[PDB]
Write a protein that binds this ligand. Structure first.
Ligand SMILES: Cc1cn(-c2ccc(C(N)=O)cc2)c2c1C(=O)CC(C)(C)C2
Length: 208
């Protein structure tokens, strides 16, 4: 069973702004997704200090960057806290609504798209380079889910029947035809070094 949901008006507005605004500094999407992964890793690591059994789903705390030229996808994998069904459908959307309002107000005042992470809606920068985003996630307190959206005001959520993850999140970016530079090893290495050199978890860039 695939469930279809409407994005709240503010989020659909944010997605349309990211997709339609002329902005050449698209590379910032990677630091934003790595930041989401780092925050998720900090959360599971902190929770594990009071409850060590929270790491029974996997002790390794890392980030993997996987390019796939055949599928035209860039995948950001983390072994962070993951997201529950409630996080995917309601909780993150609630914080995203207030974050969007503040971001769009800041943009009107003269701020640029690269400041998106300060408003906690950095995940949506994925739409600067991706025509579709698939999010596979597994939280300790819930099942493995697949969230997906090609924007257009809707997203889907289904129980994932793919390879079991243990715990964490996979953000699969189905890249736009003209954004294939983000599949090149030297381009990804350059972006990681420039914006994510001090992330407190190992970042492994997979090769093809
Ligand atoms: C806000 C927000 C933040 N994140 C997000 C993305 C990734 C991670 C992680 N753990 O790697 C954490 C949070 C999402 C949002 C959304 O509205 C849409 C979403 C629920 C599909 C994703």
């Amino acid at each position: 069973e695939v469930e279809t949901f409407a994005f709240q008006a503010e989020i659909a507005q944010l997605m349309s702004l990211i997709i339609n605004t002329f902005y050449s500094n698209k590379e910032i999407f990677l630091r934003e997704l790595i930041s989401n992964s780092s925050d998720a890793l900090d959360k599971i690591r902190y929770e594990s200090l009071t409850d060590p059994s929270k790491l029974d789903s996997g002790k390794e705390l890392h980030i993997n960057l996987i390019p796939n030229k055949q599928d035209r996808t860039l995948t950001i994998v983390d072994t962070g806290i993951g997201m529950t069904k409630a996080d995917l459908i309601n909780n993150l959307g609630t914080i995203a609504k207030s974050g969007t309002k503040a971001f769009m107000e800041a943009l009107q005042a003269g701020a640029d798209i690269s400041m998106i992470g300060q408003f906690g809606v950095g995940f949506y920068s994925a739409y600067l380079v991706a025509e579709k985003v698939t999010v596979i996630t597994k939280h300790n307190d819930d099942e493995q889910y697949a969230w997906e959206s090609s924007a257009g005001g809707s997203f889907t959520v289904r129980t994932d029947t793919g390879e079991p993850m243990g715990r964490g999140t996979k953000v699969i970016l189905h890249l736009k035809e003209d954004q294939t530079e983000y599949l090149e090893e030297r381009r990804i290495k350059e972006i990681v070094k420039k914006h994510s050199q001090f992330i407190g978890y190992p970042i492994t860039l997979f090769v093809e």
